[PDB]
Amino acid sequence: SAKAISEQTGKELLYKFICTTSAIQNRFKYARVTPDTDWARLLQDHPWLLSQNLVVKPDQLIKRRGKLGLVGVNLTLDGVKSWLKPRLGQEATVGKATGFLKNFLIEPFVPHSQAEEFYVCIYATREGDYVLFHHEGGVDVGDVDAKAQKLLVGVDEKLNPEDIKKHLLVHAPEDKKEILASFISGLFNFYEDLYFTYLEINPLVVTKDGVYVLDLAAKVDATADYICKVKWGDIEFPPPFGREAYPEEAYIADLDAKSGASLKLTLLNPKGRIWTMVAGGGASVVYSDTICDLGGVNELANYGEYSGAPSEQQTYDYAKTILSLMTREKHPDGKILIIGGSIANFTNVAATFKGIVRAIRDYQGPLKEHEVTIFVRRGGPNYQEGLRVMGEVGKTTGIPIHVFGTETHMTAIVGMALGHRPIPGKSTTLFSRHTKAIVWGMQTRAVQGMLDFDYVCSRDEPSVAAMVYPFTGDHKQKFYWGHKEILIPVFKNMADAMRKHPEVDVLINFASLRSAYDSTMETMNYAQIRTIAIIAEGIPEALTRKLIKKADQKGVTIIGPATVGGIKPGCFKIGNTGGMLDNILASKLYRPGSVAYVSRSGGMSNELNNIISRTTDGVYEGVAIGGDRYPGSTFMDHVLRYQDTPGVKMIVVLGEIGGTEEYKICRGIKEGRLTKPIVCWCIGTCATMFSSEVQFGHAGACANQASETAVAKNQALKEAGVFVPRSFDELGEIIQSVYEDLVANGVIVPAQEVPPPTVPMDYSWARELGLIRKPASFMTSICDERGQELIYAGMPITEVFKEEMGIGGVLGLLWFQKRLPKYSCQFIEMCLMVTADHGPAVSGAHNTIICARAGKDLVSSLTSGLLTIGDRFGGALDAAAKMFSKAFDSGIIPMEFVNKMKKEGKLIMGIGHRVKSINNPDMRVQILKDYVRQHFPATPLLDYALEVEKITTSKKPNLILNVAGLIGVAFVDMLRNCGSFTREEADEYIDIGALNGIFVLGRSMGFIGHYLDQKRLKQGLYRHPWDDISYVLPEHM
Amino acid sequence: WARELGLIRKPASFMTSICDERGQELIYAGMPITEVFKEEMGIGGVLGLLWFQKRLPKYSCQFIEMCLMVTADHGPAVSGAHNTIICARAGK
Amino acid sequence: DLVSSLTSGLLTIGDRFGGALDAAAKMFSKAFDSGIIPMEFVNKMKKEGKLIMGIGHRVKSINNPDMRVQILKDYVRQHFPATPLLDYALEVEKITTSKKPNLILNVAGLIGVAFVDMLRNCGSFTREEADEYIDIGALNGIFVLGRSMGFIGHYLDQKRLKQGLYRHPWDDISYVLPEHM
């Protein structure tokens, strides 16, 4: 989208970035004057003010300043100081817009004569860039396109100095031909290097000292921000005069520029009572046209749109921003929120409406005390759930919300919100039934919708032959052909896909705005591709022009970027056109018709689908060429195709504001090239009722001249012989009348309605509706991965970290689903610490080291070490705990327990040490025992184990409570002595092996440490010495 | 019941082409088990069917059997046998 | 068994599952040491057909972040002396979020970059020691030790719920066996 930049920014960029042999004068030599600044600082940082003369003019995107007396020429510092006060901060009226004066520019006065008043204008066109030079420029420039010399520079073509000298310098003075020509060349390099779309210097004054750019008006391609970021810096786009910028608009612009989706917001009247939530640029344009058609232009507050399938978070942010905007003031008549839109092709209505209802619930109070009434109309994917959540939020919040679906004609809600009605070479045939397409990008939903469309169209083969995704290896992706399961190849590179599929003739490019250009350029290197569909929005106009030039050279038809694509009922479908399969069947797009339509918008293309299905036989072919300034194929490129197609009988055109394209259709009708009936409507009639220059959501929706207004186009088409309705409301009626008149003469013969093949319902869609029953095969109660926040056994992770538990608390939550006390978690941590490692001589550490010295893996080595954890090694914890628990519960005294163990030929688990007996204890048993004594409330089993330990140490000193036995008895005591567990729960946790898990988790740290040690020491493969192995093999078996 | 009527669509999350457990007879890569035993292949033939989905010649299956025979064991001093013995002596 | 079940679960820890820690750490360390700016790193990853490890989430993008990345990032900001690699990763995260919102620093990527910063920013390690510990898979061990707690908890949950033997439904398996081999 071309956005006008201020004079100061334009001159700043020109001075910093132009590269000319001519000595550009007054580089960075200017001052900015605003109401909210001091004046001494302006003198101190700009000492040149006193040095020479001054001239002041408001830098607020206002033209005709000299004719309106807004410029003070040849005034000193005191002169301009006295000049500003009667105008600085005052009110002024230019054309139709009234506004303040918050910006002024001070620059040195240049002593120049009228003989050097030059004019240099470079503006972009579809075929290239027009550069116009006028020797007698300035105020007396007069007509420019008829008197000033014009020169075209084509796409990917350089502006040579010789051509500037010859074509552009016929009447220029000879003494200044050369340096000026070099300056012109540098200016063109500045225009095409910073992605400018308009650059008019008027006047340009060159004297013997050098060149001076007195004034310049510049419009730059904003969508090229990702290319010219370092050169633009923090570039700012001033709003049109009479309109003040708002922080909410900047926030929405940042949100739009932060993602590939479109989020346009423009505040026209903050005092207004009508606010809109319309999805789709054309949908928002027609909604605004309806609003100002009933006299709500003055009370219309904002123009807004959300497109490109915005996420739930993005839609919530947009809705909350507009709700904050709408709840500032109060209105005696109340306020209206029009949440409109077309029948969405791929915009998830459910997620966007969930975000909207979240914003409404966050703002329910101010909304209900503002008497805000909400009218919602929407269709598309999962619109039933969106309308349902709208109804529930309106019921719960108390907001009067009226929700409607497809059956509404998209404009009843506007009329009955303000109270008017009651509230209830390039080929001709691009696609055929044998068309095979390659899809760039991982878009499984779009390809599945394409396959469903093909199946319900009784196609022999799927229309998608292969997919291209550069971020994965070649494989096969699983898709549905009706109910059958099929595989579609996915290739990393274009070359392999075109090698294995020479029958592919169409590319559907789902690459982003940062990859669509390169992908399309690579695709046009293969001659088999005749049609390319570009879905990305926000491509720079220069790159799009390069794409158009290459496509015209190669004779490849391009469906312009920022489009949903197109639909040919019975033959082919592009991307997400026509919505899901339910919308395809509702609009009967599985069978050919007799009406062919072309529109700029994608959602309006689905609206046209619905209208044509309702009122006529059906749709033969529908193409959306995109909202960009330069579509790959224009209106004429498709109207000519339809006129050459015998299958169509009438053509419907849905144009927009800006662009002299419908006049080409008018000329073709005049010359008799177009004979079939045409019904055309141009949206954008509200732009003539606006005291502004508001830019619509579509990039190309901007009326440059006065002949590109929608009203003028519609008027000319009415005198062109085109059936033009009074408004978009009457479009359905006029199309129906034309269809009836054409079928009454026998031109149209509707075919027999053959029922389409049926496609089985989606399992997820059926589960969402609650139509089917499938039992869950798994149960879990320790962790909830789904949702906004991770949950550990009912506790959010943020609350887990705020409660200041550590490994012990998380372990308790995950293993026992209990909120353990602080001492229990700390004791669990100590148990993990003391069982971390016990040297490399144990079986598990030995196995881990053996697997590590084989250079296998961390996971494999740790796993091999852990697989030895069992009865003989690492099981003394659970065994000791079970033995002591059984002894304590049996009621036998410790001496009886010792005697029973002795007479059964069993050694007491957890009793006995190797060196440390008494007066030199374990130093691991002591720390844990002290902690348990100090912190545990009651330790019955620990006392029983200590009595058993006394009895065993009365036999021989080294029969002490082991670390395993102590940890087991203390873990049982913690389980059955804290309030978290009942006795049954503790017994079950002991039975299932909680202490086995404790030991394994503790020793895993040591095993991983051993693996890391062996990999750091770079130890080679181990082989056991033969002298350590006794071979007792039989004599001969 | 809905799947039997063909009323709903649920893509399969897994793919397999080496063995068909369902049906009247067990199938090894398109070959019935009774036909597997009647064709008189052994470990080599079943290995070829399960790993390559191919009906290998008799000499190929026999060679696979010889390869399995010669790699059966190489004493207890190797790392794998050592680890197996360590885990076994732990009574796991 | 507890050991067998935990072991079977841990044996899936590798490249596709549980390896985003080490992969993200290595990628960001290589980018930072190569001296390339974050934009150059993003362009180099894009033109090589590789996705940046540790970047991208499923639902949580902005104004609703991970709630696990935030806590660790706040702790690192408050307590770590210097975080050069974390700042580089945050610039990369800004560049990726300028493309589409859900391209944020993952828990895996954040933990990897913060672990590298801790290794090479505390006085305990020299640069060679930190590089060697990253190369040998210290973050793999970190992830395995962390996830072992959850695996043992899952085993205990399944043994408490007394769930029977599982057999995968035949309707969820596509049989593409040949005609006759």
Ligand SMILES: CC(C)(COP(=O)(O)OP(=O)(O)OC[C@H]1O[C@@H](n2cnc3c(N)ncnc32)[C@H](O)[C@@H]1OP(=O)(O)O)[C@@H](O)C(=O)NCCC(=O)NCCSC(=O)C[C@@](O)(CC(=O)O)C(=O)O
């Ligand atoms: C274009 C696309 C399809 C796909 O682009 P996406 O950005 O989504 O996905 P990606 O291709 O992956 O790009 C992201 C970049 O991040 C990179 N990346 C990913 N992961 C990464 C990782 N882990 N590490 C590093 N990098 C990573 C990835 O490599 C890429 O890098 P890059 O190539 O340089 O960009 C999407 O933008 C889109 O949908 N456009 C819609 C525009 C359009 O046609 N409008 C007209 C149709 S009518 C309408 O819309 C209005 C209406 O509402 C009507 C109504 O309702 O009335 C309706 O709907 O009909």
Ligand SMILES: CC(=O)SCCNC(=O)CCNC(=O)[C@H](O)C(C)(C)COP(=O)(O)OP(=O)(O)OC[C@H]1O[C@@H](n2cnc3c(N)ncnc32)[C@H](O)[C@@H]1OP(=O)(O)O
């Ligand atoms: C996990 C734990 O805390 S221990 C597990 C708990 N198990 C039990 O308590 C079950 C009942 N208790 C018992 O089985 C016994 O009382 C034991 C094993 C605990 C007591 O150990 P002992 O029978 O004396 O055998 P021990 O393991 O001490 O080995 C004997 C000697 O070899 C030495 N030794 C131990 N490991 C090694 C090795 N890798 N290489 C060389 N020498 C070793 C020891 O220093 C010990 O010294 P000593 O000669 O002074 O006795």
Ligand SMILES: CC(=O)SCCNC(=O)CCNC(=O)[C@H](O)C(C)(C)COP(=O)(O)OP(=O)(O)OC[C@H]1O[C@@H](n2cnc3c(N)ncnc32)[C@H](O)[C@@H]1OP(=O)(O)O
């Ligand atoms: C360990 C970590 O923190 S992740 C580390 C991963 N490694 C990387 O970071 C490498 C780079 N990143 C990426 O590969 C990608 O950007 C990703 C995978 C992280 C981003 O994820 P996506 O590509 O969107 O796939 P994702 O995992 O979100 O799955 C898609 C959807 O399935 C849903 N889903 C996830 N798991 C399940 C499940 N078990 N059952 C059903 N649905 C599920 C998700 O909610 C998600 O929602 P969406 O439809 O709104 O996107």
Ligand SMILES: Nc1ncnc2c1ncn2[C@@H]1O[C@H](COP(=O)(O)OP(=O)(O)O)[C@@H](O)[C@H]1O
């Ligand atoms: N630096 C300067 N030195 C001398 N005169 C200047 C300078 N800048 C502007 N002017 C005067 O301003 C007039 C140009 O008005 P301009 O701002 O181009 O009108 P508009 O706002 O309609 O473009 C010229 O006639 C010129 O005399």
Ligand SMILES: O=C([O-])CC(=O)C(=O)O
């Ligand atoms: O810790 C002990 O004393 C016994 C041992 O070696 C182990 O299993 O770790």
Ligand SMILES: O=C([O-])CC(=O)C(=O)O
């Ligand atoms: O944590 C994530 O977001 C990715 C994941 O599922 C895992 O490996 O645990």
